[PDB]
């Protein structure tokens, strides 16, 4: 029996995203009220708002934690066309300012021409990198060259998707046999545009991200995308939130030694398609092992999906808020 717990988020408007820290002891929430809030889990399992500040001049669409090796770093993105990076200064602020002051805005990334719809830190083995996607159809990848100086972020890569970008996912695979990959989703409502999920692979020879694949079977608007954590699989798994939940496996085809600079070709299979929300699916998230998928939709439910030992995916749980 899953126990739902209400948290009085005290946001003045709609909450767009919730992100846990790497240890699952802190969470960040972001809202149309232009604010980010941080919440800490006490030993009794209660949640307490430990920081609340205005971050942006428009609705905050996403919030993400960096890996704890880079310290206590948050990124937020917004309708105001910016992404902001925040660092928590852990220090003795004398016992009178426990309300709001330990999060410092280190930078504002302003290169995007329209709404920045999603923001994701890269896997830690790539360094302190931040991807942003914008409705202008561009993914921008920034790097902080010095973790001690989070005020400086260099634009390393610009990826033209040629579609309005809605969501991004880094492939978390630490395998040196796999070039760094990014999946990009599009919320474009045009029925004439097939392939609203695009996969980009970093090509070492060109020092650029090149389009490896396009999921032509995904013609519906994409609201969220997530690569599953790769704990020793010879293939990738991608979840896609659209009118339904889709799960794709992507097996890299062995590079025939004859294409001296090609992107990796993938053998792609749809291993699951679930219409059980009977409505649009807004979010998809993998467990840390990449074995259980959570999805949320307009049906007001969170659904849990898991493969059995025959690779048959099933709904294993439904959580409903009261």
């Amino acid at each position: 029996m899953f126990v739902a717990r209400s948290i009085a988020a005290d946001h003045k408007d709609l909450i767009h995203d919730v992100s846990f820290d790497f240890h699952g002891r802190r969470m960040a929430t972001c809202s149309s009220d232009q604010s980010v809030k941080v919440w800490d889990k006490s030993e009794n399992g209660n949640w307490h708002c430990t920081a609340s500040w205005k971050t942006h001049s428009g609705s905050v669409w996403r919030v993400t934690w960096a890996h704890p090796e880079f310290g206590q770093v948050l990124a937020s993105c917004s309708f105001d066309r910016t992404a902001a990076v925040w660092e928590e200064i852990v220090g003795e602020s004398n016992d009178k300012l426990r309300g709001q002051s330990h999060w410092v805005k280190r930078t504002t990334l302003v290169d995007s021409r329209t709404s920045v719809t999603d923001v994701k830190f890269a896997p830690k083995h790539m360094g302190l990198m931040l991807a942003t996607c914008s409705a202008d159809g561009v993914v921008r990848i920034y790097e902080a060259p010095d973790v001690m100086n989070l005020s400086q972020w260099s634009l390393q890569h610009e990826i033209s998707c040629k579609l309005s970008c809605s969501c991004i996912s880094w492939n978390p695979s630490s395998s040196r046999a796999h070039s760094p990959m990014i999946a990009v989703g599009s919320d474009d409502s045009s029925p004439n545009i097939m392939g609203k999920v695009q996969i980009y692979e970093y090509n070492e020879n060109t020092r650029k991200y090149a389009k490896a694949e396009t999921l032509m079977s995904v013609s519906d608007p994409v609201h969220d995308i997530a690569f599953a954590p790769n704990l020793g699989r010879s293939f990738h798994i991608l979840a896609v939130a659209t009118k339904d939940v889709r799960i794709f496996t992507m097996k890299p085809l062995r590079k025939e030694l004859s294409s001296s600079g090609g992107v990796t070709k993938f053998e792609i299979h749809t291993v699951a398609q679930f219409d059980n929300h009977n409505s649009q699916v807004w979010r998809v998230s993998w467990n840390i092992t990449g074995t259980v998928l959570a999805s949320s939709g307009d049906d007001g439910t969170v659904r849990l999906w898991k493969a059995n030992y025959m690779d048959n995916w099933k709904c294993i749980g439904v959580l409903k808020g009261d």
Binding site: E256, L257, S258, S259, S260, G261
Partner: protein, 112 residues
């Protein structure tokens, strides 16, 4: 290395070999050119050779050495009977160097 459609009178080493050295029955320039190419191939092989002027690569030099120098060396007159072999050695040294360091890659079998 660049053939423009309209000049029927080539300027350069290929005409000096066919009109000047062939009349003198002595081939010092052709051997010195083969020696230059032999030394340049040993010290640096540029993949982008001729990029922007023509299709990149070594093929125009290989065609001159193969078709104009090597395949014709026997049909030429030589004032010194030994120089016939000096020309053959100088071109074959280049071919040996070009093949020695070459390893077949999958990329070589795809039309770029």
């Amino acid at each position: 290395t660049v053939r423009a459609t309209g000049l029927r009178q080539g300027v350069g080493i290929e005409v000096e070999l066919n009109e000047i050295e062939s009349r003198c029955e002595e081939y010092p320039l052709t051997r010195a050119f083969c020696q230059l190419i032999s030394t340049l191939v040993e010290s640096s092989f540029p993949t982008n050779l001729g990029a922007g002027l023509r299709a990149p690569g070594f093929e125009p030099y290989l065609q001159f050495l193969r078709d104009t120098v090597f395949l014709r060396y026997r049909t030429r007159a030589y004032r010194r009977a030994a120089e016939k072999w000096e020309v053959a050695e100088a071109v074959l040294d280049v071919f040996y160097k070009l093949l020695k360091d070459y390893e077949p890659q999958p990329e070589d079998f795809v039309d770029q």
